[PDB]
Design a protein around this ligand. Sequence first.
Ligand code: A91
Length: 207
Amino acid sequence: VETFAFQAEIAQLMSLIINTFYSNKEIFLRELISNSSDALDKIRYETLTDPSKLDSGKELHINLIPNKQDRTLTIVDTGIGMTKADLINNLGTIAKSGTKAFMEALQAGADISMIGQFGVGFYSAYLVAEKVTVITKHNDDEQYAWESSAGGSFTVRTDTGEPMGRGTKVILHLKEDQTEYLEERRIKEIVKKHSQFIGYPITLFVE
Ligand SMILES: Cc1cc(C#Cc2ccccc2CNn2ccoc2=O)nc(N)n1
């Protein structure tokens, strides 16, 4: 297991999301589904010129899986997936400028719900999760497990769990007072309100 430190700017963003009083937490879902949609659009586009890129799975969809026993809400997509390089450097590099812009916008009057317009919506997951685990598999890389409870660091390890073929699984270990996001009617409500026109099937599993 490798332990890495977030760039100061991203750690700052995460603490703001965790510390700022902001009731409209449900927007975290739209941000994650949006990321999944972008990842699906990407593998889709790439397969138009290299069909073999779908040998790891032709289905392009999103699964939303709640589990009360483990108190988790998992967002699963069969998108392009992330490389180890994305996990350690690429994503953080891009998020740096997005965070700055977002920060400046906030002090200018914007609010947390607009985080997605700055390209760093992923971190909104910390509005409802005490810990986030990301299992991902990109075509020319191994399957990895990324994890972070914020606090300034994250870990990456080669994942030996059940292989997923291709895609990303964001596991949200929900905070004790945010279990409403495990309820089918609540998830259904949120998807209908903020993600009704996603161009991929979104299946809401039931417990
Ligand atoms: C390929 C792909 C990418 C994403 C994403 C993202 C994204 C976009 C902007 C800033 C930070 C991130 C993610 N950062 N993450 C997620 C695990 O390790 C990280 O550093 N989400 C999905 N579902 N699929």
